[PDB]
Design a protein around this ligand. Structure first.
Ligand code: AKG
Ligand code: AKG
Lengths: 215, 217
């Protein structure tokens, strides 16, 4: 998160927020990749959709993330191949690519803000490769929950509460598992008093302690 | 592509900038080193991994030619420390630049941010393709999907399909697909018996890679 906000704000009279209700699509596979986006409030899910209807989550984007990054690849005018959806209610800015290109020229300083933003995305995607590299599905779940604690967490007496409504199917789609398995594993974590769930919001106790097993 | 442009830009980031050689298996940066440089991989493959206290390494990226990496330096500079291990997976040729020399070249050569932004966008997309590979629930499909990425990244034409132009130990494969070595040995054995790949001195050839990728639609 940073003053990506300030600079996106001034790319327009001012650039206007676009709102998306929970579950609405920001872009569809097959759409032209002609815009870059700054997520301002909420979380955006990027997924791969297969012919069977099955959907796999490739990114759960946090506030102040740059995305739609395919659009920066020129000279290809190609099409979106992921589906971007508002995972919660969402506020974002969106900019046609030509505008971006030009703003970078007439203010060199803002190159540096974008490079930092894309660097941060690379690192966050690599953290999700680590989560998925685990063979114990439990460790995989715990690792994913710690990333969410960091990305979407708010303080609690007990620990950190993930400020997101999480369905078990949504967790399954993000950690390469199934609803049934996720339910069993969340159940085990609850019995052991490592987490608690209230209204589909997972609170994890002692996330710093719990993250030790991940050397 | 942006590849040509990254090369030129980096090459002309002089006192003209000199290629550095790394022998196979040599470390480019260790966890705990200060994050003071950005890198451009020119020839070869660089393995990025996480190292746990047991000494076990997990692969987080097998970087292909013309990749920008060391990207943590673009946030924090020397201020923060590396937390991944970068290793020359083959013999490697690369350019590297102190972070300050980068930032300065960007202000002086405005349009050059573009080329860097393309490079980093490309890294995001490749890492996401690796999340897809790893999302697969059965190890077999994980393996095949990985091998197809490698065909694209490091493949050369063979008269049967594509040869992945890298030596791939069973251990190395296991560290990349979240499996055990034993599982990889058996799966590579199954792919050979089904006449889907051939292996010679650790170089894997996959027959008809386009047809095989259709199963992943
Ligand atoms: O990670 C991202 O920024 C979204 C991927 C993308 O740009 C696209 O699908 O067009
Ligand atoms: O993904 C990369 O470019 C390498 C990650 C990095 O910059 C670092 O670990 O310092």
């Amino acid at each position: 998160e940073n003053s990506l906000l300030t600079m996106f704000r001034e790319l327009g009279l001012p650039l206007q927020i676009e709102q998306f209700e929970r579950g609405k699509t920001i872009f569809f596979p097959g759409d032209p990749a002609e815009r870059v986006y700054l997520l301002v409030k909420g979380a955006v899910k990027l997924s791969r959709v297969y012919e069977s209807g099955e959907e796999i989550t490739v990114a759960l984007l946090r506030e102040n993330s740059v995305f739609g990054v395919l659009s920066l690849l020129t000279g290809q005018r190609s099409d979106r191949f992921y589906h971007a959806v508002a995972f919660t209610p969402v506020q974002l800015f969106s900019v046609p690519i030509e505008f971006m290109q030009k703003a970078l020229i007439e203010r060199p300083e803002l190159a540096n803000v974008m490079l930092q933003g894309l660097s941060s995305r690379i690192l966050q995607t690599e953290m999700m490769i680590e989560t998925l590299a685990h063979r114990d599905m439990g460790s995989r779940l715990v690792s994913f929950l710690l990333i969410l604690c960091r990305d979407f967490g708010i303080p609690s007496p007990d620990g950190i509460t993930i400020d997101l409504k999480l369905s078990h199917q949504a967790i399954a789609e993000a950690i390469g598992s199934t609803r049934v398995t996720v339910t069993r594993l969340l159940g085990d974590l609850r019995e052991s008093k490592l987490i608690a769930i209230h209204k589909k919001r997972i609170t994890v106790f002692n996330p710093v302690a719990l993250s030790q097993q991940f050397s």
